[PDB]
Amino acid sequence: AEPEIIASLAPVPAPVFAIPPKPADYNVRTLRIDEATWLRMIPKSMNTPFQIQVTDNTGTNWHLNLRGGTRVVNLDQIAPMRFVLDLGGKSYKETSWDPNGKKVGFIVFQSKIPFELW
């Protein structure tokens, strides 16, 4: 257990202090921005959705829509990591949208403008 390490009063290197970690679970939609410092939101009342086109590694093009209330994860200062997403049990059903047969994916943006001003 290493009592002197766990009770030091001076800075300790991260490789020395660290131990094998464990996975964690979250639900991004139900989190709160004030507590979660790694989440960014497009502020509401923006109320004018805009379309956009993005190409994948192979070269195929895809269409996405960005509106007010969209959340992203700040990928800076969070260390190498792996994300797995599961949508089992949700509905995502609307009058003019049937989820069966549709496609979902991860999109990564690199930009110089803060995400809130988009």
Partner: protein, 59 residues
């Protein structure tokens, strides 16, 4: 995402984030505090400095 353009009236959900996310570190030499990486950590100052909400929302 769709190969064709999506009419903004048909789709109203901002995203598909209403799901379950599993997050796993890919290294054992980095440590984060309140969601940001630090090179060194002082153990004595981590005592009594975490609310339940912060601990739940931590990395």
């Amino acid at each position: 995402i769709d190969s064709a353009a999506i009419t903004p009236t048909n789709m109203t959900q901002p995203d598909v984030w209403d799901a379950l996310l599993t997050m796993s570190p890919l290294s054992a030499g980095e440590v984060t505090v309140k969601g940001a990486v630090v090179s060194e950590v002082v153990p004595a100052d981590l005592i009594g400095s975490y609310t339940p909400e912060s601990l739940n929302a931590s990395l």
